[PDB]
């Protein structure tokens, strides 16, 4: 993709004790016009891993299609063997690299979250194929804005509980609602555990404007 | 230019201006901007003209062939998928503002939108065209959940009226389309 | 470079980080970014260093002239008007990202100046390259009418987050507090980063270098 | 760059009670050298030198201009100049050409005129001063001299180890450098006397 | 384009330019003169954009003659060199820059002989031997091979003979005749014009 | 970058420096530029490391193929021809390569000069590189055909010393190879500063 | 528009000993004016006697690592024996020239043992040359690190200083000092240090922290 | 960004968002986008910020000096003429979306519009700002001639509400200004 | 003005027997958005001549100001002498030429119509200073569209009556409403005779759309 | 840049190229040979991009030798000229064009001697005398004053001597030695190497 038409915005994900929470909003802005204000930007992959992305929404639909077909195929193998989330991460990295090697990149910014076999997993995939693991990921302007809250609390406390993690995600999305121009007060939280994968509904934020009464 | 599709309980309602322009000169004063594909499914276009015409012809080809081979009436989401595949695989050279609507026996009336990129979404109402921003300004003001047919006709009539009145590219004459289970009822308003 | 400003219940607490990079190499570990203007008004700069320096010295000279001509304490709004008029007169050629703060008779007043000449009065601002992390800490943990130690801890936290994010400073975050009566200025506030001790004595010796031509010149 | 048109490297290093300044000797156009005796360290009064690096035109012009203003100051006022005063003068002279800028990075190293206090600072091509405590460098090669001096510097230095430390730093950083070489001159000054030594550097 | 050589001795300066005034295909003039007698013991050479060469000769030559008629005496070579450098550095930062390549050859009663070296960016130099051009490359390897600071003038003439004979061997331009000067305790003495039949 | 080559009565002299910079930054001081193609061939490195290394390695491969198929050692001109033919197929695509080919022949001495511009030429004296002109000057001072052995050694050594003394992009160890009738022989690898002390006086 | 390269930065060091090859690298991965992580080791353990470090563009580093591992397994499953060090160096040079006209933007250092059991550092360039040198510093902090190693490993520019063979723990304190001293001035260096030591008995690793900015 | 001015019988009513942005980052969350000049005359700005600030200060200078020399309250059309001259004279460097409104004793409430070019026109209502196209879509739909004060307040509230909801640059909080013969009544609303 | 912000559109003018009729519409479009749909693009100069223009409306306000001041000055001379329309045409031509000589052109297209001393006058002024007289003028796209109708009827009949001229103007404006994208169904007709200068109200057009019932 | 004259006689062809193989500063080789004996009575010259010269020489020379071994006899000069022109016209409109400047010199049993003239745009010409480079410019005028269709070969050699003596007088490049061929009823006879000592 040379020119991204319909972009999303920042995606937040962080591990906790035996699970990964991912939250991204539901906005499909074109240029500055928030044209598609009710879209889904997280795919709930089969039972362990879970995907969220940024960049071109059409490319996300495309990779949604391809990953869905591959997951359906392994589940129809009937062998009792699944994809680890790290295997999905490797495949996606190779896919993005082979996209940009042919000078036709997929304009995305993807976050892979998974919990399989006791261990959580949270992987990152860039457009250029830059890919790594991290205890807390933040895309787009989130790496500029909501990343230091994650890096503050994880330095202050390396492990978490589910409630503290979810609350921290809520606070970061509030902050992104405050000062991202491409943002919207409607977001959805998605969560993986060993109990399965769960997508919560379109939550919102609670804002403050008491600094506006000053001059 | 400015195209619009609104669904209701029974079916969907379409609408467009005409005014095919080239630069600042009007080449054509009256245009079938909306195009039949199947007997129950329409699409209305924007952007470049030749691109959307050739794509719509190929979609008519593939969709007619598939729906004859099924020996069943086609889905609407299927035609949306066809426009999605042809738009996304060969973007880069096209400028398509394709909006798919149409009644279905299984799923009722549906409205899909395919903008210049190639994403596909189902909507309850849609805008499209360069002069669509303004009535996109108030279509989230005037909309009420659960309209009738006449409320949709009056609604889109006021919409395309103000869009044709304000935008320089929009104008011409008003074409409407009402698609339901019963039949296809098209009409042309003027003045 | 991450400067910040805030208004507590009485005055203004300013902070800074003092890594003056020239391109990609750390060129300085201690660069005074908190500049003098008046006995009550201070200023911080960002972006092009020498432009901010020459401009802030010129405006401080002009306000010293005006204040000694008047015979009373200067006003912050006069500094704001001079700065915005000068920066608009240079048409945005001079890049000077400024934070202006002082306490007048009316009380504390904080201004941020964008280098074309657009200015704003705010209860809290962040400027610089890593300003986003400090603005994150501000938008998370600001409340109106903070106290003194609360505001100092907050500004320290913000500049600390800017330092744990990229292009902060090695420096020991500088602070400055302006009240109605008491002006303070604290360079070595908190040193989080001790330098690691050397592991070998890689000291040269008295003759390990060939000398071609010596000279001695006595003095007084 | 335009700074890499004629090469050049100036290092200044602060010792315990004394200060050492050194520079390279090579002069030439982009790949063709010309001479090995081009002067880049100028005396500005007693026990205080200045070094200039970059394009040689602005080197000689700013050195003569600064000598002009310096003698006018020292004749209107009988005392000799303090180093902060010289720093402010060089900053003003460079900032007068804000949009017509000279291409130079002046380095000032001198002692106190009243006490024996050393002083180092450096400026940019528009007039940004920077006072430090260990060393300042300028010219084309930067990262080499930063790595060497951050490797070898100690706070309290007798002048001999000061001389040898700045000697090894200049020699190694010049031998890694391409466009700046062909000998090193070193000025090691103090309250009592002024020493100028030339080292046997590689002529390659 | 071409090069004019400037060999310094113990008590003499051996300068030698060419006589070529070509224009981009044809050699219009084969006895051109680039030698500008400033004073009784001060020479000057110039190569560059050939509309600037003449204006430098007017300005420098006549302003030095103005100093000579004003005060009572001849300049040092050093002050003359600095004055040329100053006028380059002043004429550079304008709408009208000059693009010339000079070198200066003088003789003092006290300093003895002196050789200088300009550039189109106004750089002074106190050189043992200078260079410009492509002959810069060739003449400086050969000359830097065979140099002695205490060299007699006939050894320098023989070295220059050899250097020109190795200039006519792998050079693309023509350069048929070189004129040669010398400066001594007396003044400017013109030696014979140095050409070679090549083959 | 400064290389040279010249053949004479007693075979061929090839010398080179060992400095390979990167812009304004020197990478190494001991870059062995004269690529030993065969026990009877010597190739050089003239502009670009990877291109010279790759194409001369491929040429060594091809020459070994030719000998193992014909039981008869390849000539010099044939090798230069193969190198020029392989280089010509990427003309304009941005290859910088100005290498030299030296060796002993059935005809005797052989000295060719192959460019990435494809300027395959014979000759008697050559010099390639940024400071090659300096070598041309001092070499065409000291050149003859009827030279001695140690004279040619001193000629090449003085040549590389003057070249690296004037040019900035040259330096490091001075290699020195000598092509004989039977095979080539490395003479010495001499540092610049040692030569500066020896030849400064 | 779309630019195909991006500068991730990084610093890789190598020291060739008498019977050891020490390769060390920080684990900071950044981009522009951000930090992506503080754990991304540039070192990779190929065989029992070979450690490779890869800096520059990160995706090409990962891709190149995986291709090298594949060809290692191909050589093993074809020829019943592991590769040497110089064969791997030659193979990497063939690869880097095999994408000449769309280059990898990757600096590479392979350390390891030769067949004599001695240390060997093979440096590289983005286009595919290599040479057996004793020490290299690749990446952003190359110029901050080469002259100090020229002073200490090479014993250059010194007078009457004899040549002692570089022992192990001397090399360790050297590596620690150069990464601390370079982390003082670099912006692309810090947050950890992964030190790989190749002996005649295997590969050792060691984790040393740094300053957190 | 999105600025609005509506007159009514007694006086005029203004309105703006706040949200001063730079690119995609918000520099300032709350802003006095409308500016007092005289005690009865406001102006609300758009385009670049520094341009409008300097122009508004110079207009404040000239108008205050002139109105002191008249010893009479100034006109609104006078200030509009001042903005016209200063905008037109440096149209090459300024980006001003200045809209002048204000009550006058001789002429009541008036609304003048000066866009980026430098033309001057009297209007009954005005839009302004980059996210103003949408409520410009329906400001010719909802408007009724002869509103009251409360109808104008509700009108501009709905206007700036939908503009702030839809446009990315617009948003923040709603600031209002009511200018009549009696006084100037400002308030900060949200909803 | 280098870049025209707010442009007008085409202006039509034609002589008749003892008078000149000029009609232009009332639209102030910015780009394609018809932002100012009620503006005046004709200045009624004192009693004889009369001006209509196109292009940037701000420059038209400027020339309105300057010409108004000049006419006021001569009328305050009190000499009984006025400007002939041809003198105004000359002045405007010299003004535009001296404007464009400084590489800062006035983006306009102006038409001067006047009736003085028995004889009508209809002058043209371009941005570049190109200036001439004509029995019928047409600016912008009017020179492409309504010019051949004028030149048709003037070839078939060189003189006209006032009613025929006004009807022909009405038809040409109807056609321009049909196929100019920058056009609007609201225009005002201005007419000069010896009886004075008269500005008629905002007239409209009567359109046809019976081709739309075809396919 | 460089130069080759193509004088046609009544029953002979006088071609003369140079021996210069310079590269952009230095004259690397002063005994270069641009003369390509196609057959027993057909010569070929070439000037252009010096990587293309050799590859064109390979192609044409070996395909003509191939024709000679095929059919049993020598080509006409005319068919060889057309074949070269044809190969230029095919090689131009591709991804790999050639930028060379040729001329062909042959001798028929029936047509006698023949001179052709190419260009880098594949144009045939049947010329009385041709040239290339910048000495082309000067020399065809010099040659065009003093031409006779019935000219003897020693007059042509003397004429070429005069033309070279006027080439070394106002030209910017060096061109020290010219090699000279001749074509007769016998074949290709090499004349002596023609250089001049200038001064």
From Swiss-Prot, chains A, I:
It is found in: Cytoplasm; Nucleus. Induction: Up-regulated in fibrolamellar carcinomas. GO terms for molecular function: lipopolysaccharide binding. GO terms for biological process: negative regulation of inflammatory response to antigenic stimulus; proteasome-mediated ubiquitin-dependent protein catabolic process. It comes from the Eukaryota. Coiled coil: none annotated. GO terms for cellular component: ciliary basal body; cytoplasm; cytosol; extracellular exosome; mitochondrion; nucleoplasm; nucleus; proteasome complex. The modification Phosphotyrosine is found at residue 57. Belongs to the peptidase T1B family. The 26S proteasome consists of a 20S proteasome core and two 19S regulatory subunits. The 20S proteasome core is a barrel-shaped complex made of 28 subunits that are arranged in four stacked rings. The two outer rings are each formed by seven alpha subunits, and the two inner rings are formed by seven beta subunits. The proteolytic activity is exerted by three beta-subunits PSMB5, PSMB6 and PSMB7. Forms a ternary complex with SMAD1 and OAZ1 before PSMB4 is incorporated into the 20S proteasome. Interacts with PRPF19. (Microbial infection) Interacts with HTLV-1 Tax protein. This is Proteasome subunit beta type-4. The chain holds residues 46 to 260 of 264 of the full protein.
Curated annotation (Swiss-Prot), chain C:
The keyword Nucleus applies. Keywords: Cytoplasm, Host-virus interaction, Hydrolase, Nucleus, Protease, Proteasome, Threonine protease, Zymogen. It catalyses: Cleavage of peptide bonds with very broad specificity. Expressed at a low level in colonic mucosa. Up-regulated in colorectal cancer tissues. Its EC number is 3.4.25.1. It is found in: Cytoplasm; Nucleus. The active site is at residue 1. Belongs to the peptidase T1B family. The 26S proteasome consists of a 20S proteasome core and two 19S regulatory subunits. The 20S proteasome core is a barrel-shaped complex made of 28 subunits that are arranged in four stacked rings. The two outer rings are each formed by seven alpha subunits, and the two inner rings are formed by seven beta subunits. The proteolytic activity is exerted by three beta-subunits PSMB5, PSMB6 and PSMB7. (Microbial infection) Interacts with HIV-1 Tat protein. This is Proteasome subunit beta type-7. The chain holds residues 44 to 263 of 277 of the full protein.
Swiss-Prot record, chain D:
One of its GO terms (cellular component) is proteasome core complex, beta-subunit complex. Pfam families: Proteasome. Gene3D superfamilies: Glutamine Phosphoribosylpyrophosphate, subunit 1, domain 1. It comes from the Eukaryota. Its main location: cytoplasm. The modification N6-acetyllysine is found at residue 76. It is found in: Cytoplasm; Nucleus. GO terms for biological process: proteasome-mediated ubiquitin-dependent protein catabolic process. The keyword Acetylation applies. InterPro entries: Ntn_hydrolases_N, Proteasome_beta_3, Proteasome_bsu_CS, Proteasome_sua/b, Proteasome_suB-type. The modification N-acetylserine is found at residue 1. The keyword DNA-binding does not apply. Induction: Up-regulated in asthenozoospermic sperm. CDD domains: proteasome_beta_type_3 (cd03759). Non-catalytic component of the 20S core proteasome complex involved in the proteolytic degradation of most intracellular proteins. This complex plays numerous essential roles within the cell by associating with different regulatory particles. Associated with two 19S regulatory particles, forms the 26S proteasome and thus participates in the ATP-dependent degradation of ubiquitinated proteins. The 26S proteasome consists of a 20S proteasome core and two 19S regulatory subunits. The 20S proteasome core is a barrel-shaped complex made of 28 subunits that are arranged in four stacked rings. The two outer rings are each formed by seven alpha subunits, and the two inner rings are formed by seven beta subunits. The proteolytic activity is exerted by three beta-subunits PSMB5, PSMB6 and PSMB7. (Microbial infection) Interacts with HIV-1 TAT protein.
Curated annotation (Swiss-Prot), chain F:
Induction: Down-regulated by IFNG/IFN-gamma (at protein level). Induced in breast cancer tissue. Up-regulated by sulforaphane in breast cancer cells. One of its GO terms (biological process) is proteasome-mediated ubiquitin-dependent protein catabolic process. One of its GO terms (molecular function) is peptidase activity. It catalyses: Cleavage of peptide bonds with very broad specificity. It is an enzyme of class 3 (hydrolase). Bortezomib binds at residue 49. GO terms for cellular component: centrosome; cytoplasm; cytosol; extracellular exosome; nucleoplasm; nucleus; proteasome complex; proteasome core complex. The active site is at residue 1. Keywords: Cytoplasm, Host-virus interaction, Hydrolase, Nucleus, Protease, Proteasome, Threonine protease, Zymogen. It is found in: Cytoplasm; Nucleus. Its EC number is 3.4.25.1. The 26S proteasome consists of a 20S proteasome core and two 19S regulatory subunits. The 20S proteasome core is a barrel-shaped complex made of 28 subunits that are arranged in four stacked rings. The two outer rings are each formed by seven alpha subunits, and the two inner rings are formed by seven beta subunits. The proteolytic activity is exerted by three beta-subunits PSMB5, PSMB6 and PSMB7. Directly interacts with POMP. Interacts with ABCB1 and TAP1. Belongs to the peptidase T1B family. This is Proteasome subunit beta type-5. The chain holds residues 60 to 260 of 263 of the full protein.
């Amino acid at each position: 993709t040379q020119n991204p038409m319909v972009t999303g915005t920042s995606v937040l994900g962080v591990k906790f004790e035996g699970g990964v929470v991912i939250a991204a909003d539901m906005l499909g802005s074109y240029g500055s016009l928030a044209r598609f204000r009710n879209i889904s930007r997280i795919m709930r992959v089969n039972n362990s891993t879970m995907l969220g992305a940024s960049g071109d929404y059409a490319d996300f639909q495309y990779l949604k299609q391809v990953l869905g077909q591959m997951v359906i195929d392994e589940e129809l193998l009937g062998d009792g063997h699944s994809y680890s989330p790290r295997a999905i991460h490797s495949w996606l990295t190779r896919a993005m690299y082979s996209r940009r090697s042919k000078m036709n990149p997929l304009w995305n910014t993807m976050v892979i979250g998974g919990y399989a076999d006791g261990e959580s997993f949270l992987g990152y995939v860039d457009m250029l194929g830059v890919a790594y693991e991290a205890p807390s990921l933040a895309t787009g302007y989130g790496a500029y804005l909501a990343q230091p809250l994650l890096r503050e609390v994880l330095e202050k406390q390396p492990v978490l509980s589910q409630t503290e993690a979810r609350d921290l995600v809520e606070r970061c999305m509030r902050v992104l609602y405050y000062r991202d121009a491409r943002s919207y007060n409607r977001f959805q939280i998605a969560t993986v555990t060993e109990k399965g994968v769960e997508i919560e509904g379109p939550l919102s934020t609670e804002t403050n404007w008491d600094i506006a009464h000053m001059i | 230019t400015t195209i619009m599709a609104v669904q209701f309980d029974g079916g969907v309602v379409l609408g467009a201006d005409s005014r095919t322009t080239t630069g600042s000169y009007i080449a054509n004063r009256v245009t079938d901007k909306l195009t039949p594909i199947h007997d129950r499914i329409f699409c209305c276009r924007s952007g470049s003209a030749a691109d959307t015409q050739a794509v719509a012809d190929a979609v008519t080809y593939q969709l007619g062939f598939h729906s004859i081979e099924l020996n069943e009436p086609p889905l609407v989401h299927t035609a949306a998928s066809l426009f999605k595949e042809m738009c996304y695989r060969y973007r880069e050279d096209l400028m398509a503002g394709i909006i798919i609507a149409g009644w279905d026996p299984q799923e009722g009336g549906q409205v899909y939108s395919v903008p210049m990129g190639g994403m596909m979404v189902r909507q309850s109402f849609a805008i499209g065209g360069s002069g669509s921003s303004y009535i996109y300004g108030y279509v989230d003001a005037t909309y009420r959940e659960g309209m009738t047919k006449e409320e949709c006709l009056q609604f889109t009539a006021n919409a395309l009226a103000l869009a044709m009145e304000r935008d320089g590219s929009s104008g011409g004459v008003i074409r409407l389309a009402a698609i339901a289970e019963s039949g296809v009822e098209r009409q042309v308003l003027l003045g | 470079t991450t400067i910040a400003g805030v208004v507590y219940k009485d005055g203004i607490v300013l902070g800074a980080d003092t890594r003056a990079t020239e391109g990609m190499v750390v060129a300085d570990k201690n660069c005074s970014k908190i500049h003098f203007i008046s006995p009550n008004i201070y200023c911080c700069g960002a972006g092009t260093a020498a432009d901010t320096d020459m401009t802030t010295q010129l405006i401080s000279s002009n306000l010293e002239l005006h204040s000694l001509s008047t015979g009373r304490l200067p006003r912050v709004v006069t500094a704001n008007r001079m700065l915005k008029q000068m920066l608009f007169r240079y048409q945005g050629y001079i890049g000077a990202a400024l934070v202006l703060g002082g306490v007048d008779v009316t009380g504390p007043h904080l201004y941020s100046i964008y280098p074309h000449g657009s200015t704003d009065k705010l209860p809290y601002v962040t400027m610089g390259s890593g300003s986003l992390a400090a603005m994150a800490v501000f938008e998370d943990k600001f409340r109106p009418d903070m106290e003194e130690e609360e505001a100092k801890n907050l500004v320290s936290e913000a500049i600390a987050a800017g330092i744990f994010n990229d292009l902060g400073s090695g420096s020991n975050i500088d602070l400055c507090v302006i009240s109605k009566n008491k002006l303070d200025f604290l360079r070595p506030y908190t040193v989080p980063n001790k330098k690691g001790t050397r592991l070998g004595r890689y000291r040269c010796e008295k003759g390990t270098t060939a000398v071609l031509t010596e000279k001695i010149t006595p003095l007084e | 760059s335009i700074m890499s048109y004629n090469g050049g490297a100036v290092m200044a290093m602060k010792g315990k009670n004394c200060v050492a300044i050194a520079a390279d000797r090579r002069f030439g156009i982009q790949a063709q050298m010309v001479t090995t005796d081009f002067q880049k360290i100028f005396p500005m009064g007693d026990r205080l030198y200045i070094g200039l690096a970059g394009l040689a035109t602005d080197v000689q012009t700013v050195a003569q201009r600064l000598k002009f203003r310096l003698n006018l100051y020292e004749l209107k006022e009988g005392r000799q100049i303090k180093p902060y005063t010289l720093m402010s003068m060089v900053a003003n002279l460079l900032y007068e050409k804000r949009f017509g800028p000279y291409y130079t990075e002046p380095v000032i190293a001198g002692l106190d005129p009243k006490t024996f206090k050393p002083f180092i600072c450096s400026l940019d091509l528009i007039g940004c001063p920077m006072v430090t405590d260990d060393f300042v460098v300028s010219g084309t090669c930067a990262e080499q001299m930063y790595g060497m001096c951050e490797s070898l510097w100690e706070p309290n230095m007798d002048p001999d180890h000061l001389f040898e430390t700045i000697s090894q730093a200049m020699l190694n950083a010049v031998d890694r450098d391409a466009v700046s070489g062909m000998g090193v001159i070193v000025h090691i000054i103090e309250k009592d006397k002024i020493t100028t030594r030339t080292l046997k550097a590689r002529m390659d | 384009m071409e090069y004019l050589i400037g060999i310094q001795g113990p008590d003499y300066v051996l300068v030698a330019s060419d006589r070529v005034a070509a224009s981009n295909i044809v050699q219009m003039k084969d006895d051109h003169d680039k030698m500008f007698k400033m004073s009784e013991k001060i020479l000057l050479l110039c190569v560059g954009e050939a509309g600037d060469t003449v204006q430098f000769a007017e300005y420098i030559q006549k302003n030095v003659q103005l100093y000579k008629m004003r005060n009572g005496y001849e300049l040092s070579p050093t002050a003359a060199a600095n004055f040329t450098r100053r006028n380059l550095a002043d004429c550079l930062r304008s709408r009208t820059p000059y693009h010339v390549n000079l070198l200066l050859a003088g003789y003092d009663e006290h300093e003895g002989p002196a050789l200088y070296y300009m550039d189109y960016l106004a750089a002074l130099a106190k050189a043992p031997f200078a260079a410009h051009g492509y002959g810069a490359f060739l003449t400086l390897s050969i000359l830097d091979r065979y140099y002695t600071p205490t060299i007699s003038r006939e050894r320098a003439v023989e070295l220059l003979r050899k250097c020109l004979e190795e200039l006519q061997k792998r050079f693309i331009l023509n350069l048929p005749t070189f004129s040669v000067r010398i400066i001594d305790k007396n003044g400017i003495h013109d030696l014979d014009n140095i050409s070679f039949p090549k083959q | 970058t400064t290389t040279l080559a010249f053949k004479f009565r007693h075979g061929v002299i090839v010398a080179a420096d060992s400095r390979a910079t990167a812009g304004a930054y020197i990478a190494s001081q001991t870059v062995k530029k004269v690529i030993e193609i065969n026990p009877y061939l010597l190739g050089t490195m003239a502009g670009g490391a990877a291109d010279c290394s790759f194409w001369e390695r491929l040429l060594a491969r091809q020459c070994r193929i030719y000998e193992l198929r014909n039981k008869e050692r390849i000539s010099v001109a044939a090798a230069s021809k193969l190198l020029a033919n392989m280089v010509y197929q990427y003309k304009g695509m941005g290859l910088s390569m100005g290498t030299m080919i030296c060796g002993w022949d059935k005809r005797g001495p052989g000295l060719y000069y192959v460019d990435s511009e494809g300027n395959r030429i014979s000759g008697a004296t050559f010099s390639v590189g940024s400071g090659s002109v300096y070598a041309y000057g001092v070499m065409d001072r000291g050149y003859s055909y009827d030279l001695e052995v140690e004279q040619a050694y001193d000629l090449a050594r003085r040549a590389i010393y003057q070249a690296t003394y004037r040019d900035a992009y040259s330096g490091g160890a001075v290699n020195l190879y000598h092509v004989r009738e039977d095979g080539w022989i490395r003479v010495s690898s001499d540092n610049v500063a040692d030569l500066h002390e020896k030849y400064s006086g | 528009r779309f630019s195909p390269y991006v500068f991730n930065g990084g610093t890789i060091l190598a020291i060739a000993g008498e019977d050891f090859a020490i390769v060390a690298s920080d684990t900071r991965l950044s981009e522009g004016f951000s930090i992506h992580t503080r754990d991304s080791p540039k070192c990779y353990k190929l065989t029992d006697k070979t450690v490779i470090g890869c800096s520059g563009f990160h995706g090409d580093c990962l891709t190149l690592t995986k291709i090298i591992e594949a060809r290692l397994k191909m050589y093993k499953h074809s020829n019943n024996k592991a590769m040497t060090t110089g064969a791997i160096a030659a193979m990497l040079s063939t690869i880097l020239y095999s994408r000449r006209f769309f280059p990898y933007y990757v600096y590479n250092i392979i350390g390891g043992l030769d067949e004599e059991g001695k240390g060997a550092v093979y440096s590289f360039d983005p286009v595919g040359s290599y040479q057996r040198d004793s020490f290299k510093a690749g990446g952003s902090a190359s110029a901050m690190l080469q002259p100090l190693l020229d002073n200490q490993v090479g014993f250059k520019n010194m007078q009457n200083v004899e040549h002692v063979p570089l022992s192990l723990d001397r090399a360790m304190r050297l590596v620690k000092d150069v990464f601390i001293s370079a982390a003082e001035r670099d912006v692309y260096t810090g947050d950890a240090l992964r030190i790989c030591i190749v002996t005649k008995e295997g590969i050792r690793e060691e984790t040393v922290s740094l300053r957190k900015d």
